[PDB]
Design brief:
Number of strands of chain A: 8
CATH topology of chain A: Immunoglobulin-like
Number of helices of chain A: 0
Radius of gyration of chain A: 16 Å
Helix content of chain A: under 10%
CATH class of chain A: Mainly Beta
Oligomer: homodimer
Strand order of the largest sheet of chain A: 1-2-8-7
Number of domains of chain A: 1
Shape of chain A: elongated
Largest sheet of chain A: 4 strands, antiparallel
Order of helices and strands of chain A: EEEEEEEE
Distance between the termini of chain A: 27 Å
């Protein structure tokens, strides 16, 4: 499960999700009925080569999904997202 | 704990570590005696503002450290590292 921090400033709700190996265009950020913010996507996996040998396998892959019900002060039509170095930031202005 | 995959191809040992939020310059990649590869660093935390309210705190911070003993076929002096999308790739040629 995706680790997400959620902070509320006087100006905005700010979400930060750790999504290593993804960039912005691969993460779907959307608003659903009832003030719900949804983040989702799929982390892709490199194709294996016959000549590869593994010594450690610890990283996860596959689908991720988180949903947050924002409070009434949030301007859900003004959601903006950006990503850098594996961290997604979603800002919902108040 | 940092998740690290280690693959060995005919050409190299390839390590991939999920280190979201870190710049390449913040990650120390070092070779120590006895063919040990060490990866370490510290993820910084944004200065707290008294006016903020936290709704969710899930993301890790603080120091990390992993060590790997490479086999004799690794050319430890030719190590290279790069980071992209919160993934550190360390390549040790064979």
């Amino acid at each position: 499960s995706t680790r997400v921090d959620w902070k509320e400033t006087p100006e905005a709700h700010v979400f930060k999700a750790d999504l290593p190996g993804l960039k912005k265009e691969e993460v779907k950020v959307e608003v659903e009925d009832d003030r719900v913010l949804q983040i989702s996507g799929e982390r892709s996996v490199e194709k294996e080569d016959k000549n590869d040998e593994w010594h450690r396998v610890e990283r996860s892959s596959g689908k991720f999904l988180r949903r947050f019900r924002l409070p009434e002060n949030a301007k859900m039509d003004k959601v903006k997202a950006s990503m850098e170095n594996g961290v997604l930031t979603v800002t919902v202005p108040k």
